[PDB]
Structure formats: C-alpha cells, structure tokens
Amino acid sequence: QPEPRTRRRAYLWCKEFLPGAWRGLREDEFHISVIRGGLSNMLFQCSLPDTTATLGDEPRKVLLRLYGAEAMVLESVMFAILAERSLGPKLYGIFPQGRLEQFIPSRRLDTEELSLPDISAEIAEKMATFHGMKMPFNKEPKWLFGTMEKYLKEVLRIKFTEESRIKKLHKLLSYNLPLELENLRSLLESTPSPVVFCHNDCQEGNILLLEGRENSEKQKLMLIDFEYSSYNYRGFDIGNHFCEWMYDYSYEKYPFFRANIRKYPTKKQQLHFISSYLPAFQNDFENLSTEEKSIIKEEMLLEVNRFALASHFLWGLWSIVQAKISSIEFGYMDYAQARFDAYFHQKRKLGV
Amino acid sequence: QPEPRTRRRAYLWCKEFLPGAWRGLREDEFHISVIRGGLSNMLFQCSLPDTTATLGDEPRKVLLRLYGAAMVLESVMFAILAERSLGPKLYGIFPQGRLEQFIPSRRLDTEELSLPDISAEIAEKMATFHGMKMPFNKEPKWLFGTMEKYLKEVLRIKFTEESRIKKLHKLLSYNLPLELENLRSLLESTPSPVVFCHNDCQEGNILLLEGRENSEKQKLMLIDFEYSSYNYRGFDIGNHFCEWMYDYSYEKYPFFRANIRKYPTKKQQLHFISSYLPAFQNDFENLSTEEKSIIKEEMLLEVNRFALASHFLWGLWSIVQAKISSIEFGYMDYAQARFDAYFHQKRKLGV
Numbered sequence A: 001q002p003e004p005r006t007r008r009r010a011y012l013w014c015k016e017f018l019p020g021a022w023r024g025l026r027e028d029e030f031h032i033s034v035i036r037g038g039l040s041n042m043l044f045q046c047s048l049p050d051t052t053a054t055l056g057d058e059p060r061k062v063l064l065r066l067y068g069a070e071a072m073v074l075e076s077v078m079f080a081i082l083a084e085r086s087l088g089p090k091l092y093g094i095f096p097q098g099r100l101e102q103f104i105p106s107r108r109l110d111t112e113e114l115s116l117p118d119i120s121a122e123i124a125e126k127m128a129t130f131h132g133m134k135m136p137f138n139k140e141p142k143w144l145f146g147t148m149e150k151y152l153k154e155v156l157r158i159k160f161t162e163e164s165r166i167k168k169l170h171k172l173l174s175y176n177l178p179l180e181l182e183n184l185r186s187l188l189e190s191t192p193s194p195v196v197f198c199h200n201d202c203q204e205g206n207i208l209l210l211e212g213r214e215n216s217e218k219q220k221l222m223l224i225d226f227e228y229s230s231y232n233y234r235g236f237d238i239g240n241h242f243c244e245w246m247y248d249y250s251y252e253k254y255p256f257f258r259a260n261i262r263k264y265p266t267k268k269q270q271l272h273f274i275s276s277y278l279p280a281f282q283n284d285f286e287n288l289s290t291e292e293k294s295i296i297k298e299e300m301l302l303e304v305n306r307f308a309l310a311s312h313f314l315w316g317l318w319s320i321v322q323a324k325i326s327s328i329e330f331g332y333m334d335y336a337q338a339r340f341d342a343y344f345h346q347k348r349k350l351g352v
Numbered sequence B: 001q002p003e004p005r006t007r008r009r010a011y012l013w014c015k016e017f018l019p020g021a022w023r024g025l026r027e028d029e030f031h032i033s034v035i036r037g038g039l040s041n042m043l044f045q046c047s048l049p050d051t052t053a054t055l056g057d058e059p060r061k062v063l064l065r066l067y068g069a070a071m072v073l074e075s076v077m078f079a080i081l082a083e084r085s086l087g088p089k090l091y092g093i094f095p096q097g098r099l100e101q102f103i104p105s106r107r108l109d110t111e112e113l114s115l116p117d118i119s120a121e122i123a124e125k126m127a128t129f130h131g132m133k134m135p136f137n138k139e140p141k142w143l144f145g146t147m148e149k150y151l152k153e154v155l156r157i158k159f160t161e162e163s164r165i166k167k168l169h170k171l172l173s174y175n176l177p178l179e180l181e182n183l184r185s186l187l188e189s190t191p192s193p194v195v196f197c198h199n200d201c202q203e204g205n206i207l208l209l210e211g212r213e214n215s216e217k218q219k220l221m222l223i224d225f226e227y228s229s230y231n232y233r234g235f236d237i238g239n240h241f242c243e244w245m246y247d248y249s250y251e252k253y254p255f256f257r258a259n260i261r262k263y264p265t266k267k268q269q270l271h272f273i274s275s276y277l278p279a280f281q282n283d284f285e286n287l288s289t290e291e292k293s294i295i296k297e298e299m300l301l302e303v304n305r306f307a308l309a310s311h312f313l314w315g316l317w318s319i320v321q322a323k324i325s326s327i328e329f330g331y332m333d334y335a336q337a338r339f340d341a342y343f344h345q346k347r348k349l350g351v
C-alpha cells in the first residue's frame, strides 16, 4: 500500500527492467504492496494482474528493495554472484535507489525453530556450502576486529542527552571496553579458525522457510540478507549463530526483544550442528578415524564458543552505535547490556 | 617492468585477494610486468615464481587492471559474464581496479575479421552474448541517448590549435543536429530487436586463444564489455561491420588507416548473419529455405542502416576524445573518416 511517489517509480523500474508482460504494462494495472516500511531498507511486493498472461521467463511477481537512507559495488557484485550461483535470490534489476529481486514465497524462521534438529542440521549445511564459495573479495581476516575497533572508537566519542541512555552508556563504559577488546583479541589470536566467506549475520530473521518444502528434510531453507558478509573467521559465523538461539526480536513491547541465556545450545546440540557442517564443508571428513573425528569436533567447539565471544562484543558495540544514529523503535541500549551480560557470563563459563 | 609505486600495491592486492601460494608470497617473490601502460586501464601481468608450486587450483598468472584516470553496473556485469564463462574470471575486485584471469592470447588484426572462419565465430559469439539476461534497463535509450550526450559536448568543444579548429569547423558544417534527426527518422522506421549488445566489437576486443588457432569454431573470446548495454542488435552488427574498414595498428600518425573498400561484401555479410541467426534463435535452422532468405535480406537492410549510427556515434565520440584524451591518436582525422564513411554509406543505401 505504498505512497504515490514510490510505486510510480516502482512501476517505472519494473516496466523497464522486467521482460515479458511487464514491458507493456500500464500504470493502472500495476500491483504493489508493502512488506516492510521504515527509512533504510523498504521492501515491496510487485506483480502483474492475475488476469495478465506472462509471455515467457519473466516472473509474475518480484521484490522491490529501496536502499533508503562505494561499498555498494561489493554488495551489488556479491548479490549478483550468489544469484548466478543459485545460493541467493535471482537479480532482475539493479539501480542506484535499490534493486529488483526474485520474490520467494516463504516466511522467516522463529527463534525457537533454530533449535529443531532438522532445521539446525540444514542451517549447518547451508552455512558450510556458503563457506566454500570463492568471492572476489579481500581474503585477509581483518573484518572482525577492524569492525569492532571502528565501532569502539565511535562508541567512546558519543554522548547521549536523555538520562536513561546516559546511564546505561556509562555502565557499559565501566567495563573498560578498549582493554577488554584487547583481552579478547589476544584470546582469539591464539584460537585457530579457518578464514572463509562468512554470512556474519545468520539469525532467524535472515533464514527463509521455503514454501512447499516443509517436508523435505535437508532442503527447505535459504540464507538471505548478505549485507554483512565478508571473509572472516569461520568460528565467528557459527558462534554468532549459536548466540542468536538466545535472542527473540519478535517481542512486541520495549525493549522489543527477550534475552534467555538458558537457550544457548547445549553441548549435544552444538555437536548436532557441527556434525552436519563438517561433512558438508570438507570431503574426506566422513571417513576419518572415529577417533580423529572427535578431536576435530571437540576443538571446533572451543573455537566456535570462543568466537561467540566476538559476536557478543561486536553486536554489543554495534547496538550502542545504533542507539545514537538509528530512529527505529528498538531498545538498542538494553540490547547492548544484554550482549555484554552474555559476554561476561560466557567468559565465566569458559574459564577464559 | 613497472615503477616502484605500484609494484607494491600490486603485490598487496595479489597477496590479499588470491588464494594458494599467493597467501604466503614474499614481496621479493612477486613478479609483475607491464602489458599496457598509459593513463587509464593500465594492464599488468602478475605471476608466481616458476620455482613456486601452487597449493590448490589458484591461478599461476593473473591480469591486473587499474582504472587510473557506470561504476556499479560495470562491476556487476563483469562478475556476471565471468560467472557464465563468457568473460575472464574475476579474481578480485577493489575501488581502484580489479584482478582478472590472464588469458594466453593475442588480439585479432583488422584483416582477420574477414576470414570466413573468424567472422563465423564472431557472429556466433555475438549472438550468444545477445541472448543473455542482465539486470539492466531494457529500454533502448543508449544509442541516441549517447549520441545526444556527445553532440552537446561537441557543440561546446572549443579547440586551441588552429588545425583542430579548422577540422572541427569542417565537421560542424555538416549540421550534425539536423543530421542526427534524419538518422533517427531512419532508424525509427527500421525494426531491430533490443538485446544485450557488446557495442564495441572491434578486433582489439576479440582474443585469439593461444593453443587453438586450429579450432574451427572455438578459438575466440569477446572482451572489454565497457560499453555494453541493451541496444538495437542492428547496431552491434553494423558497428562490427564498420570495423572491417579501420586498422588501428598503423604506426605513423594519425595511427589508423581507413579503407572503404574493405567493408564486407553482400556475400561476406550473408556469411556472418548465416552464422548469427542459427546461434540467436535455434529454431531458425529449421525454417524454409525461402523463409530464411526473407529474414536474411531483412537483416541486411537492418544492419546496414544501423551501421550509420556506428559512424555517427563514434564520430562524435572521436571529436570529444580529441579534446580530452591523452592517448596519442589522430582522433579528429578518425572523426573525419567516420563521417565520410557516414555520408558515403547514406549514398550507397540511397537513404
């Protein structure tokens, strides 16, 4: 149900980028609905009249994405490659204000569904698959600390007015974040983790349950929303996803999420995850001595659980930045504290 | 060999974007030599020590392209053609250039365009290029949109040296603005399907892949897609036809030769489209002999009319380049040649 400005532009983009019955479509026969509002990444559904016949390949329906409010070449290139490789939505139109993507009938996963075994198992293969991909991007694992550093620096020089924000900020600064960041760096630099191509934001909202596939056991999911992807420590991608088991963002009152540290996957669950990931990420694995299979798994658990620490720290720092620059209704500061609570609680669990 | 102020940048770009041996490579193991210097799109050949064994399936040798002297589209496109195996693989992409697959090869010379085998494959490859879907605007704005952009530039160009002034004055005296409109009226009444066109299909942009000079139908690749867009197919073919007449390897100023006689004969043209059509609508082969001729005769009128836009567009392009480019080349004489070819071709076609 868009506003007159968009939808007219939406109409123009579709008629000009989409082949088939689109190219002759009149404005008056153009259907567009909202999927998400806001000011950053607005989403719309666009479609032909149901009375209108497609001529060929062209889709009956597409997703319009407006970038809203030159790393945008990397994002664009990346998205086009995953499309060609069928890992992502097909790409029908790229232009300065946004893109036109394949519409994929689906819903997103809920937080509690992440712990379902088949779900978890598939997510593990998908992420594996994702990791084996060559991408024309810088292969140096600089993203994780480069990004945390960047946020830290921002964080240190931001000043709130509103009282409750000024308080929450000082308590977080109590921890001495620069010292802690460095503590975390040395801890992780001593933690071997293969640099690969990482989703980096693999949470339930960015995983699709594909329609008509809810019976297929290993084949009903697609990972989307690749905006944070980059070559990174594998441990981060897996640990960050483990961390997401703990957070529910569908909560309808301020601060608009629930943290539950008891929901972090158990040892048995993590093993169930990486037991799908591992054979999906390398060849000979399936038939290594059952004795050495364990050694890798046990080491992989220390790895992901350590890097899950970076997930807490990164997104905690990120969250604080969002509290200053974002207008979206979300308790970013409360969510900041939550991630640092988990950070230190997770610390005490690992004896590190 | 290159200058020190780039041999490093290149080493870093390679160490950091390429897998395999490239990961641990020491600055004193890095080999890099120039392919084409210049001011923009400087080419380089970066390679591993012959004494270094590759760890995986990483490339031993890669091409580095510096942008030097659009933007998102050009990069998406290259990534895509690489993903489809129409273009060189894309090994690394960054703000001031990119790493591409190095293809052992040489460029076609002008005269090779007319070898029946070479011009058959080019037709086939252009046809294949033409069937590709790309995430770009499918409205055929590019042709006259660019000619207007250039014409406006030209009517604004002011030259310093008396000669360029004379020449620009001989060109302006054709009344480009009125001529453009005569052209539009002609092409508007000339049916031509819109497709993804290479738009610059000249010999310098067609590689002859070394080690298959003997292949009959698989010895070429089209490259340099830097002008590619959705456009009237007639232009891509017409433009390529025009390129039979110009040889850019001439070593004395103005550094090209134009040769009207070397424009493809009806027979040669039919030979080209006879390869193109099968490759562009697979059913075409099964048509009635008589019907094929209907369509061929029809495509001849099409491509030869649009060849006019090739002369016009690039003629205007060449005046602009005279003022701005630092590449040594008689742009203004090339412009004059293209407009001569433009008016001669109008007379030939009686249009």
Ligand SMILES: CN1CCCN(Cc2ccc(-c3ccc(CN4CCCN(C)CC4)cc3C#N)cc2)CC1
Binding pocket: A201, A203, A205, A228, A249, A250, A251, A252, A256, A315, A328, A329, A330
């Ligand atoms: C005020 N509103 C209440 C309920 C939802 N809402 C909009 C709304 C608001 C906020 C979110 C949301 C906020 C933070 C996070 C945490 N991040 C996880 C770590 C990294 N990912 C970079 C980026 C987000 C997730 C979600 C997620 N998913 C999602 C939707 C509409 C009305």
Ligand SMILES: CN1CCCN(Cc2ccc(-c3ccc(CN4CCCN(C)CC4)cc3C#N)cc2)CC1
Binding pocket: B200, B202, B204, B227, B248, B249, B255, B314, B327, B328, B329
């Ligand atoms: C050291 N050198 C001295 C003299 C120039 N030189 C380099 C050199 C030689 C020729 C060209 C050159 C100039 C114009 C054109 C015409 N254009 C055709 C229409 C559109 N295509 C956009 C782009 C080019 C082609 C070439 C082509 N190919 C450009 C650079 C050779 C040794």
